[PDB]
Short mmCIF file of all heavy atoms in Angstrom, two decimals:
data_model
loop_
_atom_site.label_atom_id
_atom_site.label_comp_id
_atom_site.label_asym_id
_atom_site.label_seq_id
_atom_site.Cartn_x
_atom_site.Cartn_y
_atom_site.Cartn_z
N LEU A 1 0.84 -1.19 0.00
CA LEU A 1 0.00 0.00 0.00
C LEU A 1 0.88 1.24 0.00
O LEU A 1 1.99 1.24 0.53
CB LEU A 1 -0.94 0.03 1.21
CG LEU A 1 -1.83 -1.20 1.42
CD1 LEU A 1 -2.70 -1.03 2.66
CD2 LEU A 1 -2.69 -1.46 0.19
N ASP A 2 0.36 2.31 -0.61
CA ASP A 2 1.08 3.58 -0.72
C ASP A 2 0.30 4.63 0.07
O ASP A 2 -0.76 5.09 -0.37
CB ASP A 2 1.23 3.98 -2.19
CG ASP A 2 1.57 5.45 -2.37
OD1 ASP A 2 2.77 5.79 -2.29
OD2 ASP A 2 0.64 6.25 -2.59
N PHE A 3 0.83 5.00 1.23
CA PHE A 3 0.16 5.97 2.11
C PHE A 3 0.65 7.39 1.86
O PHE A 3 1.01 8.11 2.78
CB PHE A 3 0.38 5.58 3.57
CG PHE A 3 -0.14 4.21 3.91
CD1 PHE A 3 0.73 3.19 4.24
CD2 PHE A 3 -1.50 3.96 3.92
CE1 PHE A 3 0.25 1.93 4.56
CE2 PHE A 3 -1.98 2.71 4.25
CZ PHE A 3 -1.10 1.69 4.57
N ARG A 4 0.64 7.82 0.59
CA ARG A 4 1.00 9.20 0.29
C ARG A 4 -0.09 10.17 0.73
O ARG A 4 0.21 11.29 1.15
CB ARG A 4 1.27 9.36 -1.21
CG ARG A 4 2.68 9.79 -1.56
CD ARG A 4 3.71 8.78 -1.07
NE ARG A 4 4.93 8.84 -1.87
CZ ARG A 4 5.81 7.85 -1.97
NH1 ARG A 4 5.63 6.70 -1.35
NH2 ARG A 4 6.89 8.03 -2.72
N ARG A 5 -1.35 9.75 0.63
CA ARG A 5 -2.51 10.56 0.98
C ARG A 5 -3.41 9.79 1.93
O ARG A 5 -4.62 9.67 1.73
CB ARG A 5 -3.28 10.97 -0.27
CG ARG A 5 -2.41 11.28 -1.47
CD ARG A 5 -3.21 11.24 -2.76
NE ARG A 5 -2.37 11.47 -3.93
CZ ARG A 5 -2.83 11.82 -5.12
NH1 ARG A 5 -4.12 11.99 -5.35
NH2 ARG A 5 -1.97 12.01 -6.12
N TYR A 6 -2.81 9.26 3.00
CA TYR A 6 -3.44 8.29 3.90
C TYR A 6 -4.92 8.51 4.19
O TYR A 6 -5.69 7.55 4.03
CB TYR A 6 -2.65 8.25 5.23
CG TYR A 6 -3.43 7.65 6.38
CD1 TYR A 6 -3.85 6.33 6.35
CD2 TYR A 6 -3.74 8.41 7.50
CE1 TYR A 6 -4.56 5.78 7.40
CE2 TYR A 6 -4.45 7.88 8.55
CZ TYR A 6 -4.86 6.56 8.50
OH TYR A 6 -5.56 6.02 9.55
N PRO A 7 -5.39 9.69 4.61
CA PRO A 7 -6.83 9.82 4.88
C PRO A 7 -7.68 9.80 3.63
O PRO A 7 -8.84 9.35 3.70
CB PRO A 7 -6.94 11.16 5.63
CG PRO A 7 -5.54 11.66 5.81
CD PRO A 7 -4.69 10.97 4.80
N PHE A 8 -7.16 10.25 2.49
CA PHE A 8 -7.93 10.34 1.26
C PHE A 8 -7.23 9.61 0.12
O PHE A 8 -7.09 10.14 -0.99
CB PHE A 8 -8.17 11.81 0.88
CG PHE A 8 -8.44 12.70 2.05
CD1 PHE A 8 -7.43 13.43 2.64
CD2 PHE A 8 -9.72 12.82 2.56
CE1 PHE A 8 -7.68 14.26 3.72
CE2 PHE A 8 -9.98 13.65 3.64
CZ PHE A 8 -8.96 14.36 4.22
N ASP A 9 -6.79 8.39 0.37
CA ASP A 9 -6.03 7.62 -0.60
C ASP A 9 -6.91 6.59 -1.31
O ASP A 9 -7.98 6.22 -0.83
CB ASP A 9 -4.85 6.91 0.08
CG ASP A 9 -5.28 6.09 1.28
OD1 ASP A 9 -6.46 6.20 1.68
OD2 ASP A 9 -4.44 5.34 1.82
N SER A 10 -6.44 6.15 -2.47
CA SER A 10 -7.07 5.08 -3.23
C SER A 10 -6.03 4.02 -3.55
O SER A 10 -4.99 4.33 -4.15
CB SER A 10 -7.70 5.61 -4.52
OG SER A 10 -8.71 6.56 -4.24
N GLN A 11 -6.29 2.79 -3.14
CA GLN A 11 -5.36 1.69 -3.30
C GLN A 11 -5.75 0.82 -4.49
O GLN A 11 -6.75 1.07 -5.17
CB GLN A 11 -5.28 0.86 -2.02
CG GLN A 11 -4.96 1.60 -0.70
CD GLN A 11 -3.81 2.62 -0.74
OE1 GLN A 11 -3.59 3.32 -1.73
NE2 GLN A 11 -3.07 2.69 0.36
N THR A 12 -4.95 -0.21 -4.75
CA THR A 12 -5.20 -1.13 -5.85
C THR A 12 -4.57 -2.47 -5.48
O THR A 12 -3.35 -2.62 -5.54
CB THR A 12 -4.64 -0.60 -7.16
OG1 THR A 12 -5.29 0.63 -7.50
CG2 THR A 12 -4.87 -1.60 -8.28
N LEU A 13 -5.41 -3.43 -5.10
CA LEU A 13 -4.93 -4.77 -4.76
C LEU A 13 -4.71 -5.57 -6.04
O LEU A 13 -5.53 -5.54 -6.96
CB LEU A 13 -5.93 -5.48 -3.85
CG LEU A 13 -6.34 -4.71 -2.59
CD1 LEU A 13 -7.23 -5.56 -1.71
CD2 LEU A 13 -5.12 -4.23 -1.83
N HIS A 14 -3.60 -6.30 -6.08
CA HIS A 14 -3.16 -7.00 -7.28
C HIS A 14 -3.24 -8.51 -7.09
O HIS A 14 -2.95 -9.02 -6.00
CB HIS A 14 -1.74 -6.60 -7.66
CG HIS A 14 -1.64 -5.30 -8.38
ND1 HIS A 14 -2.17 -5.11 -9.64
CD2 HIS A 14 -1.09 -4.11 -8.02
CE1 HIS A 14 -1.94 -3.86 -10.03
NE2 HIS A 14 -1.29 -3.24 -9.06
N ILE A 15 -3.63 -9.21 -8.15
CA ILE A 15 -3.66 -10.67 -8.19
C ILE A 15 -2.91 -11.12 -9.43
O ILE A 15 -3.18 -10.63 -10.54
CB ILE A 15 -5.10 -11.21 -8.17
CG1 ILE A 15 -5.55 -11.49 -6.74
CG2 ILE A 15 -5.22 -12.48 -9.00
CD1 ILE A 15 -4.79 -12.62 -6.08
N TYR A 16 -1.97 -12.04 -9.26
CA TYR A 16 -1.16 -12.56 -10.35
C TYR A 16 -1.22 -14.08 -10.36
O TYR A 16 -1.20 -14.72 -9.30
CB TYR A 16 0.30 -12.11 -10.23
CG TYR A 16 0.49 -10.61 -10.27
CD1 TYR A 16 1.10 -9.94 -9.21
CD2 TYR A 16 0.08 -9.87 -11.36
CE1 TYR A 16 1.29 -8.58 -9.24
CE2 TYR A 16 0.26 -8.50 -11.40
CZ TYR A 16 0.86 -7.86 -10.34
OH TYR A 16 1.04 -6.50 -10.38
N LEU A 17 -1.29 -14.66 -11.56
CA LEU A 17 -1.23 -16.11 -11.71
C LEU A 17 -0.53 -16.45 -13.02
O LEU A 17 -0.56 -15.67 -13.98
CB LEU A 17 -2.64 -16.74 -11.65
CG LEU A 17 -3.86 -16.07 -12.30
CD1 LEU A 17 -3.72 -15.95 -13.81
CD2 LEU A 17 -5.13 -16.82 -11.95
N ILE A 18 0.11 -17.62 -13.04
CA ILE A 18 0.81 -18.11 -14.21
C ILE A 18 0.55 -19.60 -14.38
O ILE A 18 0.08 -20.28 -13.47
CB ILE A 18 2.33 -17.81 -14.15
CG1 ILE A 18 2.91 -18.00 -12.73
CG2 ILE A 18 2.62 -16.41 -14.66
CD1 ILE A 18 2.81 -19.39 -12.13
N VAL A 19 0.84 -20.10 -15.58
CA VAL A 19 0.63 -21.50 -15.93
C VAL A 19 1.94 -22.08 -16.43
O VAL A 19 2.67 -21.44 -17.20
CB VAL A 19 -0.49 -21.66 -16.98
CG1 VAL A 19 -0.19 -20.85 -18.23
CG2 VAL A 19 -0.70 -23.13 -17.32
N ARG A 20 2.26 -23.29 -15.98
CA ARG A 20 3.50 -23.96 -16.37
C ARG A 20 3.31 -24.64 -17.72
O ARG A 20 2.45 -25.52 -17.87
CB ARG A 20 3.91 -24.97 -15.30
CG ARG A 20 3.78 -24.44 -13.88
CD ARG A 20 3.95 -25.55 -12.86
NE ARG A 20 3.71 -25.07 -11.50
CZ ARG A 20 3.77 -25.83 -10.41
NH1 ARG A 20 4.06 -27.12 -10.49
NH2 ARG A 20 3.54 -25.28 -9.23
N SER A 21 4.11 -24.24 -18.70
CA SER A 21 3.99 -24.77 -20.05
C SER A 21 4.49 -26.21 -20.12
O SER A 21 5.39 -26.62 -19.38
CB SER A 21 4.78 -23.91 -21.04
OG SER A 21 4.48 -24.27 -22.38
N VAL A 22 3.88 -26.98 -21.02
CA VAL A 22 4.23 -28.38 -21.23
C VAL A 22 4.44 -28.61 -22.72
O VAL A 22 3.70 -28.08 -23.55
CB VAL A 22 3.14 -29.33 -20.69
CG1 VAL A 22 3.54 -30.79 -20.91
CG2 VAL A 22 2.89 -29.07 -19.21
N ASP A 23 5.48 -29.37 -23.05
CA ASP A 23 5.81 -29.76 -24.44
C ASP A 23 6.17 -28.48 -25.20
O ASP A 23 6.79 -27.57 -24.63
CB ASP A 23 4.67 -30.57 -25.03
CG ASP A 23 5.08 -31.35 -26.27
OD1 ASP A 23 6.10 -30.98 -26.89
OD2 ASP A 23 4.39 -32.33 -26.62
N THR A 24 5.80 -28.37 -26.48
CA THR A 24 6.15 -27.23 -27.31
C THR A 24 5.05 -26.18 -27.37
O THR A 24 5.34 -24.98 -27.31
CB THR A 24 6.49 -27.69 -28.73
OG1 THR A 24 7.53 -28.67 -28.68
CG2 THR A 24 6.95 -26.51 -29.58
N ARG A 25 3.79 -26.60 -27.48
CA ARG A 25 2.69 -25.65 -27.54
C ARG A 25 2.57 -24.88 -26.24
O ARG A 25 2.76 -25.42 -25.15
CB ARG A 25 1.38 -26.38 -27.85
CG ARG A 25 1.04 -27.50 -26.88
CD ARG A 25 0.19 -28.57 -27.54
NE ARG A 25 -1.23 -28.27 -27.47
CZ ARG A 25 -1.91 -27.62 -28.41
NH1 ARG A 25 -1.32 -27.19 -29.51
NH2 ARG A 25 -3.21 -27.40 -28.24
N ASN A 26 2.27 -23.59 -26.35
CA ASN A 26 2.15 -22.72 -25.20
C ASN A 26 0.73 -22.78 -24.62
O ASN A 26 -0.20 -23.29 -25.25
CB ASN A 26 2.52 -21.28 -25.57
CG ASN A 26 3.86 -21.19 -26.27
OD1 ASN A 26 4.53 -22.19 -26.48
ND2 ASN A 26 4.25 -19.97 -26.63
N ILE A 27 0.59 -22.24 -23.41
CA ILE A 27 -0.68 -22.25 -22.70
C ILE A 27 -1.12 -20.80 -22.52
O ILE A 27 -1.64 -20.42 -21.46
CB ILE A 27 -0.58 -23.00 -21.36
CG1 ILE A 27 0.18 -24.31 -21.56
CG2 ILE A 27 -1.96 -23.34 -20.82
CD1 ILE A 27 0.32 -25.13 -20.29
N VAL A 28 -0.85 -19.97 -23.53
CA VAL A 28 -1.18 -18.55 -23.53
C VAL A 28 -2.59 -18.32 -23.01
O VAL A 28 -3.55 -18.94 -23.49
CB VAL A 28 -1.02 -17.96 -24.95
CG1 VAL A 28 -1.51 -16.52 -24.98
CG2 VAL A 28 0.42 -18.05 -25.41
N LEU A 29 -2.72 -17.45 -22.02
CA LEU A 29 -3.98 -17.22 -21.33
C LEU A 29 -4.72 -16.03 -21.92
O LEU A 29 -4.14 -15.18 -22.61
CB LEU A 29 -3.74 -17.00 -19.83
CG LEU A 29 -3.31 -18.22 -19.02
CD1 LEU A 29 -2.59 -17.81 -17.75
CD2 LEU A 29 -4.51 -19.09 -18.69
N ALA A 30 -6.02 -15.97 -21.63
CA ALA A 30 -6.87 -14.87 -22.07
C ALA A 30 -7.92 -14.62 -20.99
O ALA A 30 -7.89 -15.23 -19.92
CB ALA A 30 -7.51 -15.17 -23.43
N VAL A 31 -8.84 -13.71 -21.28
CA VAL A 31 -9.88 -13.32 -20.33
C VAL A 31 -11.22 -13.28 -21.04
O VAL A 31 -11.32 -12.86 -22.20
CB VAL A 31 -9.58 -11.96 -19.67
CG1 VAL A 31 -8.60 -12.14 -18.52
CG2 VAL A 31 -9.02 -10.99 -20.70
N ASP A 32 -12.26 -13.73 -20.34
CA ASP A 32 -13.64 -13.68 -20.83
C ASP A 32 -14.41 -12.69 -19.96
O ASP A 32 -14.44 -12.83 -18.74
CB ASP A 32 -14.29 -15.06 -20.80
CG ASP A 32 -13.97 -15.82 -19.53
OD1 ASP A 32 -13.02 -15.44 -18.82
OD2 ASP A 32 -14.68 -16.81 -19.24
N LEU A 33 -15.05 -11.71 -20.61
CA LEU A 33 -15.75 -10.66 -19.88
C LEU A 33 -17.08 -11.12 -19.30
O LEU A 33 -17.64 -10.41 -18.46
CB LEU A 33 -15.97 -9.45 -20.79
CG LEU A 33 -15.07 -8.24 -20.52
CD1 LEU A 33 -13.60 -8.64 -20.57
CD2 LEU A 33 -15.36 -7.13 -21.51
N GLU A 34 -17.60 -12.27 -19.73
CA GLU A 34 -18.86 -12.76 -19.19
C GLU A 34 -18.73 -13.10 -17.71
O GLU A 34 -19.65 -12.83 -16.92
CB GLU A 34 -19.34 -13.98 -19.98
CG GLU A 34 -18.93 -13.97 -21.45
CD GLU A 34 -19.44 -12.75 -22.19
OE1 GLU A 34 -20.65 -12.71 -22.51
OE2 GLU A 34 -18.64 -11.83 -22.46
N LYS A 35 -17.61 -13.70 -17.31
CA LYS A 35 -17.34 -14.07 -15.92
C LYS A 35 -16.37 -13.10 -15.27
O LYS A 35 -15.46 -13.51 -14.54
CB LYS A 35 -16.80 -15.50 -15.83
CG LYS A 35 -17.13 -16.47 -16.99
CD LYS A 35 -18.61 -16.51 -17.37
CE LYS A 35 -18.95 -17.77 -18.15
NZ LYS A 35 -18.51 -19.00 -17.44
N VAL A 36 -16.54 -11.80 -15.53
CA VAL A 36 -15.55 -10.80 -15.12
C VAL A 36 -15.39 -10.80 -13.60
O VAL A 36 -14.31 -10.48 -13.09
CB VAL A 36 -15.94 -9.41 -15.67
CG1 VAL A 36 -16.98 -8.73 -14.78
CG2 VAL A 36 -14.71 -8.54 -15.83
N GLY A 37 -16.44 -11.14 -12.86
CA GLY A 37 -16.35 -11.30 -11.43
C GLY A 37 -17.12 -10.23 -10.68
O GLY A 37 -17.85 -9.42 -11.26
N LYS A 38 -16.95 -10.24 -9.36
CA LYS A 38 -17.61 -9.32 -8.42
C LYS A 38 -19.12 -9.51 -8.57
O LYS A 38 -19.56 -10.64 -8.84
CB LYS A 38 -17.11 -7.90 -8.65
CG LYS A 38 -17.29 -6.97 -7.45
CD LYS A 38 -17.62 -5.56 -7.90
CE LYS A 38 -18.18 -4.73 -6.76
NZ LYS A 38 -19.39 -5.36 -6.16
N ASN A 39 -19.92 -8.46 -8.41
CA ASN A 39 -21.38 -8.53 -8.55
C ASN A 39 -21.98 -9.60 -7.65
O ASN A 39 -22.91 -10.32 -8.03
CB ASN A 39 -21.77 -8.76 -10.01
CG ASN A 39 -21.28 -7.66 -10.93
OD1 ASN A 39 -20.08 -7.39 -11.02
ND2 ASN A 39 -22.21 -7.01 -11.62
N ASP A 40 -21.45 -9.72 -6.44
CA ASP A 40 -21.91 -10.70 -5.46
C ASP A 40 -22.15 -10.03 -4.11
O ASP A 40 -21.88 -10.61 -3.06
CB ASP A 40 -20.92 -11.85 -5.33
CG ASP A 40 -21.53 -13.08 -4.68
OD1 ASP A 40 -22.53 -13.61 -5.23
OD2 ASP A 40 -21.03 -13.51 -3.63
N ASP A 41 -22.64 -8.79 -4.14
CA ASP A 41 -22.97 -8.00 -2.94
C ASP A 41 -21.87 -8.05 -1.89
O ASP A 41 -22.13 -7.92 -0.69
CB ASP A 41 -24.34 -8.40 -2.36
CG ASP A 41 -24.37 -9.83 -1.82
OD1 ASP A 41 -23.58 -10.17 -0.91
OD2 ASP A 41 -25.20 -10.62 -2.31
N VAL A 42 -20.62 -8.22 -2.33
CA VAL A 42 -19.50 -8.29 -1.41
C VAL A 42 -19.15 -6.90 -0.92
O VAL A 42 -19.05 -5.94 -1.70
CB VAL A 42 -18.29 -8.98 -2.08
CG1 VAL A 42 -18.01 -8.35 -3.44
CG2 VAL A 42 -17.07 -8.91 -1.19
N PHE A 43 -18.98 -6.76 0.40
CA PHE A 43 -18.68 -5.48 1.02
C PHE A 43 -17.42 -5.60 1.86
O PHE A 43 -17.22 -6.58 2.58
CB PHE A 43 -19.84 -5.00 1.89
CG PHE A 43 -20.98 -4.41 1.12
CD1 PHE A 43 -22.29 -4.76 1.41
CD2 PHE A 43 -20.74 -3.51 0.09
CE1 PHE A 43 -23.34 -4.21 0.70
CE2 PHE A 43 -21.79 -2.96 -0.62
CZ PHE A 43 -23.09 -3.31 -0.32
N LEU A 44 -16.56 -4.59 1.76
CA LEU A 44 -15.35 -4.48 2.57
C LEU A 44 -15.52 -3.30 3.51
O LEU A 44 -15.77 -2.18 3.06
CB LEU A 44 -14.11 -4.31 1.69
CG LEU A 44 -12.74 -4.33 2.37
CD1 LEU A 44 -12.71 -5.27 3.56
CD2 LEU A 44 -11.66 -4.70 1.36
N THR A 45 -15.38 -3.55 4.81
CA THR A 45 -15.59 -2.49 5.79
C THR A 45 -14.49 -1.45 5.70
O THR A 45 -13.33 -1.76 5.41
CB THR A 45 -15.67 -3.08 7.20
OG1 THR A 45 -16.36 -2.17 8.07
CG2 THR A 45 -14.28 -3.38 7.77
#
């Protein structure tokens, strides 16, 4: 976290994942916007 503007700051939590390649063909990843996530009435205090 970056507390440059502690009382009035905006953060950004990061998530990273990778896949271990097998043989010659790659396992290049992509994203589908249908299952973009959230939208589950989740609240953070």
Side-chain angles (χ1 to χ4, degrees):
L1 306 180
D2 163 85
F3 301 112
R4 242 60 155 202
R5 323 162 183 198
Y6 161 63
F8 322 96
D9 52 352
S10 298
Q11 306 315 36
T12 298
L13 308 185
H14 280 294
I15 267 293
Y16 299 122
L17 39 63
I18 39 61
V19 57
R20 316 169 185 179
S21 190
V22 180
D23 197 340
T24 305
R25 55 208 273 93
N26 309 359
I27 315 181
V28 174
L29 289 158
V31 278
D32 43 344
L33 254 55
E34 329 301 284
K35 337 310 199 53
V36 83
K38 202 215 164 303
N39 300 58
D40 198 59
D41 65 59
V42 50
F43 282 135
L44 186 34
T45 202

